[PDB]
Amino acid sequence: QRVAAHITGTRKNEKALGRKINSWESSRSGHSFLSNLHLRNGELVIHEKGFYYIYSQTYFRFQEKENTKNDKQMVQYIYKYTSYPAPILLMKSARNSCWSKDAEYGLYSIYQGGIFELKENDRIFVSVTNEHLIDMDHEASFFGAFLVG
Amino acid sequence: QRVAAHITGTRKNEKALGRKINSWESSRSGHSFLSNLHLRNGELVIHEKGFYYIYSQTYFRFQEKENTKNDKQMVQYIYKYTSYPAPILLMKSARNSCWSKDAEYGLYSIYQGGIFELKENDRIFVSVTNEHLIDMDHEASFFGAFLVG
Amino acid sequence: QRVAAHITGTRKNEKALGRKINSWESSRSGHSFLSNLHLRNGELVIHEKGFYYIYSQTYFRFQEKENTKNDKQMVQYIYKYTSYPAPILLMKSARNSCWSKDAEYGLYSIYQGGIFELKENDRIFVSVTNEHLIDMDHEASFFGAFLVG
Ligand SMILES: [Cl-]
Ligand SMILES: [Zn+2]
Numbered sequence: 001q002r003v004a005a006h007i008t009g010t011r012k013n014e015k016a017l018g019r020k021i022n023s024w025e026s027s028r029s030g031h032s033f034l035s036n037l038h039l040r041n042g043e044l045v046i047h048e049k050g051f052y053y054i055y056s057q058t059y060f061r062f063q064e065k066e067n068t069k070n071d072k073q074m075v076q077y078i079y080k081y082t083s084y085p086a087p088i089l090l091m092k093s094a095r096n097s098c099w100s101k102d103a104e105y106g107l108y109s110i111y112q113g114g115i116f117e118l119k120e121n122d123r124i125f126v127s128v129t130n131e132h133l134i135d136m137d138h139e140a141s142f143f144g145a146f147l148v149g
Numbered sequence: 150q151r152v153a154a155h156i157t158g159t160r161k162n163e164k165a166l167g168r169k170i171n172s173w174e175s176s177r178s179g180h181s182f183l184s185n186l187h188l189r190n191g192e193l194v195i196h197e198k199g200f201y202y203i204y205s206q207t208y209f210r211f212q213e214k215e216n217t218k219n220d221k222q223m224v225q226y227i228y229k230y231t232s233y234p235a236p237i238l239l240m241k242s243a244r245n246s247c248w249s250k251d252a253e254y255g256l257y258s259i260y261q262g263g264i265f266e267l268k269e270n271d272r273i274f275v276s277v278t279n280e281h282l283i284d285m286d287h288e289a290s291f292f293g294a295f296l297v298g
Numbered sequence: 299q300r301v302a303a304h305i306t307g308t309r310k311n312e313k314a315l316g317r318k319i320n321s322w323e324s325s326r327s328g329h330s331f332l333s334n335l336h337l338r339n340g341e342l343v344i345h346e347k348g349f350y351y352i353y354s355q356t357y358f359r360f361q362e363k364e365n366t367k368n369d370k371q372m373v374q375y376i377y378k379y380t381s382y383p384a385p386i387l388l389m390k391s392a393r394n395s396c397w398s399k400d401a402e403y404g405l406y407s408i409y410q411g412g413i414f415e416l417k418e419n420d421r422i423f424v425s426v427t428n429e430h431l432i433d434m435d436h437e438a439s440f441f442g443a444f445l446v447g
Contacts, residue, residue: 002298004200006264031239031265035200035298051302051333053202053351053444057242057261073405089437090329093355093407099398100248107222109242111261112355112409115304115442116329139238144264146202146297148444149300149333151447153349155413180388180414184349184447202351206391206410249397256371258391260410288387293413295351295446 003036003048003147009136016087018077018127021058023136024143031138037145043081043123044145052145054078054090055113056126059140060133064103072097074130076110081123090116090124109140115148152185152197152296158285165236167226167276170207172285173292180287186294192230192272193294201294203227203239204262205275208289209282213252221246223279225259230272239265239273258289264297301334301346301445307434314385316375316425319356321434322441329436335443341379341421342443350443352376352388353411354424357438358431362401370395372428374408379421388414388422407438413446 007024008031022042025032038045046052060074075094079087093112097103118124126143128134134141156173157180171191174181187194195201209223224243228236242261246252267273275292277283283290305322306329320340323330336343344350358372373392377385391410395401416422424441426432432439 002200004264004297031263033266051300051444055262057240057263059241059243061243069400071402075405091355091440092357092435092437093409094357094359094405094438095407096396096403096405098245098248099396099401100250101398101400102218102250103248104220105245107224107243107245109244109259109261110407111242112407113262113353113411114329114355114440115302115444117331137241139241140243142240142263146200146264148302151349153413153446180412182415204411206389206412208390208392210392247394247397249399251367251399252397253369254394256373256392256394258393258408258410260391262411286390288390289392291389291412295349295413 005034005037005044006142006144007032007039008138009141011137012085014086016079016127018075018129019131020125020127043125046118046120046122048147049119051115051148052118053113053115053148054124054145056143057109057111057141058128059135060108060130061135062133063105071099072130074108077127079125079127082119154183154186154193155291155293156181156188157287158290160286161234163235165228165276167224167278168280169274169276192274195267195269195271197296198268200264200297201267202262202264202297203273203294205292206258206260206290207277208284209257209279210284211282212254220248221279223257226276228274228276231268303332303335303342304440304442305330305337306436307439309435310383312384314377314425316373316427317429318423318425341423344416344418344420346445347417349413349446350416351411351413351446352422352443354441355407355409355439356426357433358406358428359433360431361403369397370428372406375425377423377425380417
C-alpha cells in the first residue's frame, strides 16, 4: 500500500556505462517524496518485492568551431543492483545532437520507463553520458518508481 | 477504485509559462475518458487525494529564408493549481528544432510523466510554447493521470 | 491482481500504418515477463477487462550523398484489435532525422504511453515506419502494459 517514489534534481565483471547521477534531492522537499522505498547514495532501495514501473527524465541542455565535429551522444541508462556482482542494465534511451554547424544550443529532455520485477534490497539508479550537460532543475530531471503489483 | 483519466486532442505572483491547452476533448468520445476525475476549462480536477502518475504527449509538427534564423524551443509544461495563489510547475520537457538550413519540416512528439501527491480539488493542466505548432490529432496529443496509491 | 507485461527485443477497411513488430521476445527471459496477459504473433492479448497503461520504446539507430535528401520520418504506432474489423490506432509518436548534410549517424529512441480501456481478448501491438532502422536490443526497445483499475 503506497509504495512509490519521485526524486528530483536539486536545481559479472561488467561495469555500468555513463556516470551515475547521485545528486537527487535526498530531503522531503515537495516534488520529491519516498513511500516504502528509500534513497541511499543516489540509488532507490526496494523494500517490497513486486512489479515496479520505473522511470526517469534527464534534461540535457547546452550552448554550442572550425574543424571541430562536436557530435554528442546523449544516453540515459537505468540500472539495477541485485544479488549479482555487476549492475544490470534495465533500459537505455539515446539521442544525438543536431549536426548543423549553425547549431547554437541544444535542448534534449529524455524520458523513458518500463515495468520490472524487483526483489527486496534491490537498488536502482540512473546514469548518463555527458553528465556535465545535465540540467538538474527539479521540474526537468527526476527519477521515480511505483509498485504496480 | 478506478481513479484515472485520459483526454485527447479533438483532431505567489509568478505566472505559468507557455500557453495553456484548453481544447482537450470534453466529451466521452473513446479514447477519452474520465473516472473519478473531471475536466473543467482544460484542467483535470482531482476528487481523491493521493499519489498520481500524471503524463502528457504533445505533438509539435510544422513545415519550414535568408537571414532568418528560425530556431524553435518546443517545451511542454505540466502545472498544478492547489491552495496557493500561483500555479506550481510539476514537470517540463524541451526540444529544439533542427538548425539546418535544409530543414523542410519538423516532427517533435514530446512525452513526459511522473508521480505527484495531489489533494482533493487540485487542478492540473498542460501548457506549451509555440502552441500554433501543436497537432491536436487524438492519437498524437493527450493528457492523463491515474491514482497509484 | 498482478496484471502486467513487459516484453523486449531479442537483441472498417482501414489498414494499420507502418510495419508491425513481431519479434518481441516470446520466452520468459528476464527483462521480459507476462502476468495475466499473453503474447501471440507479436500482440499482447488481454485476459481481464479494465484500464491499462500501455507503453512502448522503439530505438531507431542508423549510420548516414550528393542530391540525395535522406529525410526520415520515424513514427511509432500503438494499435488495438477489438470486436471491430479494422485495427484502431491508440497512440502515435514521431520524430524527423537531422537535416544536416554533415549528419553521420542518428540515435532516436521514441517512448510513449497512455491509459486505455481494454476488453477481454483485445489485442495490442506496436508498428513503426523505417523498421529496418530499429535496434532490437532488449534494453532499448520494448512494449508493456499494466492494469491500473
Ligand atoms: Cl536535429
Ligand atoms: Zn539537425
